[PDB]
Structure 1
Amino acid sequence: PNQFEGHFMKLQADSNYLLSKEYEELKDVGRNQSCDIALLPENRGKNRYNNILPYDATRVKLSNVDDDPCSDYINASYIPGNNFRREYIVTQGPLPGTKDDFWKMVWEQNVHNIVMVTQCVEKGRVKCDHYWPADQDSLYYGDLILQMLSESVLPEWTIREFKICGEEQLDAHRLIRHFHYTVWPDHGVPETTQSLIQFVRTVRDYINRSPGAGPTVVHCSAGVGRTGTFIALDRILQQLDSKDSVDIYGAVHDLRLHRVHMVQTECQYVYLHQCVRDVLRARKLRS
């Protein structure tokens, strides 16, 4: 905290010289791991980006469907957090042909919270399929029934609540909360730190009310840059509140070990430091 201020100032000195060096030191982390399963021909249509594939060692697996050996594949990865080896699932923005798989994963992994930090279309480019219902009428995604119960649209984010259940056991329904941050440009950062800090705190306070829940799903278009920055910020805000020492480098390092390119740009890495500095200054103001 008080140490982070001096540490950040050290990194920013000489036009971010040491910050850049530190970020460049991470470029190769985790990238010698294989992605052979994602490269199977029958999974080719299931990847939004050729260059963004999950590692075999950390990918999320769907239950196998008979007569299809590749029915277990989804472009998604487990990510550790501050308290669980599988605290998050990161994935790509679903395609029309994979959104049934996305909801199957949500159901099978006991997911109660989904975080989306991309718009479906940005600057005229499709980034994600509108994979949730457009109204309150329920519809099936594969063998799963989904129904949107509420939708609150604010200028910076939208929060929705879905009801999910299997067709065989309608009484075993589950509530899912969906947190959609809508003002985060691809490959960039939000216009203020305060905005994403408030969003992250909003999500975390909801996550903490679901202690028995499976991983929290976080996704953007690729499930890399904006997704990685959200998770890193979530982790370090928790560390700061728990009075522990913030470790931004370590959080991003750990992310990279589990999925390629997490926190995609140096500017996103800088933004993470600025968030911590801004929190400390708002708190040090009282002292």
Structure 2
Amino acid sequence: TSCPIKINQFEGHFMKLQADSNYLLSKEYEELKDVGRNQSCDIALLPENRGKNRYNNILPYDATRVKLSNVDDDPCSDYINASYIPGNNFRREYIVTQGPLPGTKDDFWKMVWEQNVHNIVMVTQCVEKGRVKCDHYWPADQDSLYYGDLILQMLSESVLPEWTIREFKICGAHRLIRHFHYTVWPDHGVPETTQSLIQFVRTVRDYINRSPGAGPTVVHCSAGVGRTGTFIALDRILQQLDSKDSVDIYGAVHDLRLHRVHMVQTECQYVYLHQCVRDVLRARKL
């Protein structure tokens, strides 16, 4: 369930993994294949919930799903496609979810309100080369909108070359929510540089560390598994490097997989995590 590498050995460890056409890397990534796989997704499968899943084969485990509150009238009114995920420090440091659908964006905001979320991380565009990935579930401008019993107002939007940071006020109290939208992930494969995602993660983590009251950080892409799991794994491992004498990429991904299917969905993303750590450690060493 873990594979901790001493920082001074990490360079050579990763070269070793990469030798003979990623021979041993592939072997290790495959060891993760089965983690979590005993767990059912019965609630997600109930007829009343079918329209609430973006992908009919990417569903939260019963044991770790986030539940919406309910009172009077409440079939599976408690359902959203979202899972609690541990971080470097505590259980439920994140909530991972699918890209909201037009028909579940009210549920999404209800969850953000009920869970005291102050930071949302989005690692997809809404449409990628014409394929719908996520509904545009926030306001397009500063004009307010209702989502269910909540009112949302976008107070600010700061567009940078690789991500956009929005701030919303939500009234249900009123709270300030920041949205960190990474806008450059390639349509296929991982980002072209490690620096891009490293700098994005570092920026998000700065803000999270400035939100001590908050509930979990929401992270999503389209399905809430591959890019999302890579983002969370990188956030967790970068914190390891700052605190610790070793780094456990395998262990972070193992832990993510115990909580949601497919977290870090491709070997390419698993390689990218190693290349990110390799690059940070090279710069430190120097």
Normalising TM by the smaller chain, what interval? over 0.9
Question: What residue ranges of structure 2 are gaps of 5+ in the alignment?
Answer: 1-7
Given that 1:65 and 1:71 are in contact with CA atoms closer than 8 Å, whether structure 2 keeps it comes out as no
- How much does 1:188 deviate? 2.0
The range that moved more, 148-157 or 37-46, is: 148-157
1:21/1:79 CA distance change after superposition, 3 Å = same
- How much does 1:254 deviate? 0.5
The range that moved more, 89-98 or 152-161, is: 152-161
The range that moved more, 179-188 or 57-66, is: 179-188
Helix, strand or coil at the partner of 2:219:
strand
Q: Report Cα offsets for 1:64-91 as digits up to 9, x if no partner.
A: 1422321000000000001110000000
Separation in 2 of the partners of 1:77 and 1:224?
10
Given that 1:187 and 1:265 are in contact with CA atoms closer than 8 Å, whether structure 2 keeps it comes out as no
Helix, strand or coil at the partner of 1:57:
helix
Given that 1:93 and 1:128 are in contact with CA atoms closer than 8 Å, whether structure 2 keeps it comes out as yes
Given that 1:120 and 1:129 are in contact with CA atoms closer than 8 Å, whether structure 2 keeps it comes out as yes
Separation in 1 of the partners of 2:10 and 2:154?
42
Q: Report Cα offsets for 1:24-80 as digits up to 9, x if no partner.
A: 111111011000000000000000001100000000000014223210000000000
Given that 2:190 and 2:268 are in contact with CA atoms closer than 8 Å, whether structure 1 keeps it comes out as yes
| RMSD between superposed Cα atoms in Å | 0.9
- How much does 1:186 deviate? 4.7
Given that 1:91 and 1:222 are in contact with CA atoms closer than 8 Å, whether structure 2 keeps it comes out as yes
Separation in 2 of the partners of 1:224 and 1:243?
27
Given that 1:78 and 1:86 are in contact with CA atoms closer than 8 Å, whether structure 2 keeps it comes out as yes
Task: State the number of aligned residues.
Answer: 279
Helix, strand or coil at the partner of 2:62:
coil
Separation in 2 of the partners of 1:91 and 1:187?
21
Q: TM-score, normalised by structure 1?
A: 0.96
1:208/1:229 CA distance change after superposition, 3 Å = same
Question: What residue ranges of structure 1 are gaps of 5+ in the alignment?
Answer: 167-171
- How much does 1:244 deviate? 3.6
1:105 equivalenced with 2:111 (yes/no): yes
Q: Percent same amino acid among aligned pairs?
A: 100
Separation in 1 of the partners of 2:267 and 2:255?
17
- How much does 1:116 deviate? 0.1
Partner of 1:34: 40
- How much does 1:5 deviate? 1.3
Partner of 1:248: 249
Q: Report Cα offsets for 1:213-239 as digits up to 9, x if no partner.
A: 100000000000000000000000000
User: Which of the residues 10, 19, 37 maps onto 1:4?
Assistant: 10
Separation in 1 of the partners of 2:141 and 2:69?
29
Q: TM-score, normalised by structure 2?
A: 0.96
Given that 2:118 and 2:177 are in contact with CA atoms closer than 8 Å, whether structure 1 keeps it comes out as yes
Q: Report Cα offsets for 1:91-130 as digits up to 9, x if no partner.
A: 0000000000000000000000000000000011000000
Q: Report Cα offsets for 1:245-272 as digits up to 9, x if no partner.
A: 1100000001010000000100000000
Given that 2:129 and 2:187 are in contact with CA atoms closer than 8 Å, whether structure 1 keeps it comes out as no
Given that 1:91 and 1:219 are in contact with CA atoms closer than 8 Å, whether structure 2 keeps it comes out as yes
- How much does 1:205 deviate? 0.3
Helix, strand or coil at the partner of 2:246:
coil
Separation in 2 of the partners of 1:65 and 1:21?
49
Given that 1:186 and 1:226 are in contact with CA atoms closer than 8 Å, whether structure 2 keeps it comes out as no
